[PDB]
Design a protein around this ligand. Structure first.
Ligand SMILES: CC1(C)c2c[nH]c3cccc(c23)S[C@H]1C(=O)O
Ligand SMILES: CC1(C)c2c[nH]c3cccc(c23)S[C@H]1C(=O)O
Lengths: 321, 321
């Protein structure tokens, strides 16, 4: 069985685009892959953070993943700073990186040193768990390339300890675009709040954003990205939250206009968010949340401990006991 | 009671100059100060290391400190990599340093990244234990200045957690010079082996280096650095290993020439090394050594754990449990 590792930034609420694109797919592939979902608070502080905002956001991300159906027995969901192996192996890999290498990553009071030196900590996050695949995109290519090069350098200079990972998302979900800029991907940090639907938007506010989505005044319910990216995007959201095949949405709305379709979807979005937020609140306001994250932390520690110890032996750190 | 923290590089055997200058003084001040002696293997690998040489050298340093009289109940003697707090707090401080700051420290395949980013790990080594004094010299001034500036930055941006340290050696020992270059300090890594006496030199080889020390052919046994740095250096070694006051060495050899004095000192050096190496071998070949270092590690962990947790709370890492 292949191991998958995904890092999660506690710096913002996922959108429904993030839920359709990735999160809902993870609920399925956690049966077929050995999955690690790591809330990376030690990467978050490379950027300026309000310390209270950060602890709140960490809890929120954990409750959002659990509300999505990430199962803490099938998968390992944990907070990066609670597993010491990450900074232990982050330091080991830093000593074999070069400064020039790191400065080139930057390109692709003064500048915080964390922004130069986090990539080896990212590499450590991944290799500690013998990861085979990482579900990321184009703008992480150079980071995974550094990871693979560090694994080669470590295995070459010391001895075979670490495994090289690959960029692969096992089941690609739909791509959801900005609701009022259909050519741009949806983002949680848009200056135009009408562009995205947050998983924690009020369910009434979300249905309004479906209605305010930028489209023609009327038309056919047909999937056609190049000519009608507005209605097509909404069709993608419809498919993403109902699992109804696209051709079957088309035939269902044959002879219907935009008003009927957008009314129906605004209601689907409202219902999805009502059910989702009920689960989110119960996890987020529960005492079991801390129990869940404790067990996640212990699962990760047991695996990454063995990897760290093999690295230390290969570099001559510590003692032979 | 003030806390003292000293870092020890496992990269070479201390000389008798290091024993007279510092180590023998630590055997006394460990009664009056709360002392930490940390073998910094995670700093050693910022430079290229043979991994077997490194694990051997770590054990050797620990046995040399114990053979000197560093008492594991009075003081805390431990290996840096066995206490996770050091890289945990090293990462926290790195995020508040600036790149420019770090590059300026450097000045005072390509260049290993560890050489740029170790100073915040040095700062962490010190502040984890609420250290008041560090027994270092001129070439560490900029490192302690960075440490003090980081403590100010952390306390200012988050809240009061950390303590600022000062450069202070409580009881300065004699300064021992190179035996065949009396104007230069003695160093374990001289290309001229006759310049230094290693604590693990064969006791017969050491007495020969006393005889080959560069001095006048004859003279008075008088302490006079500016005119007779050769004989004066040997007088300093005599005082350092016998504790006999210098004026009392002078009166003892009144009316004696160099031959009698150098004969006597070569025998004193030989005897000191015979007794010292017997203790060193028994610690180094013993199973209790691992027990000693285990207890040292547990002592340090209990103290630095509380500091790390206070830092994490102040930055918003982790959870409130
Ligand atoms: C910073 C980030 C969240 C991260 C830290 N550690 C990782 C391990 C695997 C995948 C990723 C990460 S994604 C990456 C990103 O830039 O989005
Ligand atoms: C690298 C070194 C051995 C070190 C690491 N961490 C420290 C904490 C206090 C004092 C020191 C150190 S001395 C310092 C040196 O350059 O000699």
């Amino acid at each position: 069985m292949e191991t998958l590792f995904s890092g999660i930034q506690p710096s913002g609420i996922p959108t429904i685009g993030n839920y359709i694109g990735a999160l809902k797919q993870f609920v399925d592939v956690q049966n077929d892959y050995d999955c690690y979902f790591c809330i990376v608070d030690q990467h978050a502080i490379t950027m300026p953070q309000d310390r209270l905002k950060l602890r709140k956001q960490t809890r929120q991300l954990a409750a959002i993943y659990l509300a999505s159906g990430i199962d803490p027995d099938k998968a390992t969901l944990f907070i990066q700073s609670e597993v010491p192996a990450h900074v232990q192996a982050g330091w080991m890999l830093t000593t074999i990186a070069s400064v020039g290498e790191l400065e080139r990553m930057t390109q692709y009071e003064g500048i915080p040193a964390g922004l130069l030196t986090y990539p080896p900590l990212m590499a450590a996050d991944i290799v500690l768990y013998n990861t085979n695949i990482v579900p990321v995109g184009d703008d992480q290519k150079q980071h995974i390339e550094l990871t693979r090069n560090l694994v080669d350098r470590f295995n070459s200079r010391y001895n075979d300890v670490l495994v090289k990972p690959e960029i692969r998302m096992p089941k690609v979900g739909g791509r959801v675009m900005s609701l009022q800029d259909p050519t741009r991907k949806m983002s949680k940090s848009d200056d135009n709040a009408k562009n995205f639907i947050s998983l924690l938007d009020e369910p009434n506010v979300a249905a309004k954003k479906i209605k305010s989505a930028v489209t023609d005044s009327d038309g056919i319910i047909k999937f056609d990205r190049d000519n009608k990216p507005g209605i097509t995007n909404l069709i993608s959201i419809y498919a993403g939250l109902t699992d109804m095949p696209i051709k079957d949405i088309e035939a269902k709305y044959e002879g219907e206009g935009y008003g009927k379709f957008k009314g129906d979807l605004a209601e689907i979005v409202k219902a999805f968010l009502v059910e989702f937020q009920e689960k989110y609140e119960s996890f987020y306001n529960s005492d079991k949340l801390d129990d869940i994250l404790d067990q996640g932390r212990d699962k990760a520690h047991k695996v990454s401990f063995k990897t760290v110890k093999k690295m230390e032996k290969a570099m001559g750190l510590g003692r032979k006991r």
